Design a binder for this molecule. Structure first.
Ligand SMILES: *[C@@H]1O[C@H](CO)[C@@H](O)[C@H](O)[C@H]1NC(C)=O
Lengths: 33, 245
């Protein structure tokens, strides 16, 4: 059916904290010329 | 995982370990998608060549484990299985097409800081994120055999263009698969089969399981890339099951 809070990490997305390797992912999606 | 590093605490809380009851053996990884449900590969529950044809009682899963060696009581939890659902057109014989399966927990896990589910991809998020060069994160475990206890590992790997995938093997790959990993390093090794390949939406900021680890061609061999079951292609099936319980 559908989970409302899914994919929001209780210790990072909730907490407004970024991990040590997720910048790497975001800045691979920056290739959209 | 080969060529990875240490995960942080509650970094992959949807991470699951698929264990055997007797003898106790790490089979595969899996992904928590709801309270009652966990997602993994079909080859982890059924593979006649390796003499695998499990049932619910044969297996037991360990949710939210940071370190595999310990019994982290009141951080992790341990759960039984009520039913196992494998894809009806899971073709083990030829290519691991539709290498997908669902496990229903006997009791529901309560979500904590260390246990929390992952989002399943939808038509938009799939087309927008499932692109060549765009990277995704695979979590798994380094096996005990050789090697700070055995803490959850993690790697980030770029999706590869479809015709580099079709040239990188001799196996008829379907549209139900995509493939990822660096060119001429890193591939989720045995223990980490059936676990998630996730991507984060820059748009809505949630984490989304794009692929399940279906196979390597060996643990990290250059020119060869790991193949992942395309979760959105088969998203349709997952719903049919979870509706019908
Ligand atoms: C697997 O086990 C089931 C349940 O006993 C059995 O009916 C079936 O013949 C087996 N199939 C394979 C492919 O091993």
């Amino acid at each position: 059916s559908g989970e409302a809070d899914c994919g929001l990490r209780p210790l990072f997305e909730k907490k407004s904290l970024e991990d040590k390797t997720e910048r790497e992912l975001l800045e691979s999606y920056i290739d959209g010329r | 995982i080969v060529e990875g590093s240490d995960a942080e605490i509650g970094m992959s809380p949807w991470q699951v370990m698929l264990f055997r009851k007797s003898p106790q053996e790490l089979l595969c990884g899996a992904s928590l998608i709801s309270d009652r449900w966990v997602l993994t590969a079909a080859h982890c529950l059924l593979y006649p060549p390796w003499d695998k044809n499990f049932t619910e009682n044969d297996l037991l899963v360990r949710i939210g484990k940071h370190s595999r060696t310990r019994y982290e009581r009141n951080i992790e939890k341990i759960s039984m299985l009520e039913k196992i659902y494998i894809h009806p057109r899971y073709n083990w014989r030829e290519n691991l097409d539709r290498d997908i399966a669902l496990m229903k927990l006997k009791k529901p896990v309560a979500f904590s800081d260390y246990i929390h589910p992952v989002c399943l991809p939808d038509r938009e998020t799939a087309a927008s994120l499932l692109q060549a060069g765009y990277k995704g994160r695979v979590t798994g475990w380094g096996n005990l055999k050789e090697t700070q206890p055995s803490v959850l590992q993690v790697v980030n790997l770029p999706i590869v263009e479809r015709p580099v995938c079709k040239d990188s093997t001799r196996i008829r790959i379907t549209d139900n698969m995509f493939c990822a990993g660096y060119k001429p390093r890193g591939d989720a090794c045995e223990g980490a089969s059936g676990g998630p390949f996730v991507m984060k939406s820059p748009f809505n900021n949630r984490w989304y399981q794009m692929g399940i680890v279906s196979w390597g061609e060996g643990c990290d061999r250059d020119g060869k890339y790991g193949f992942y079951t395309h979760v959105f292609r088969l998203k349709k099936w997952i719903q049919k099951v979870i509706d019908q319980f």
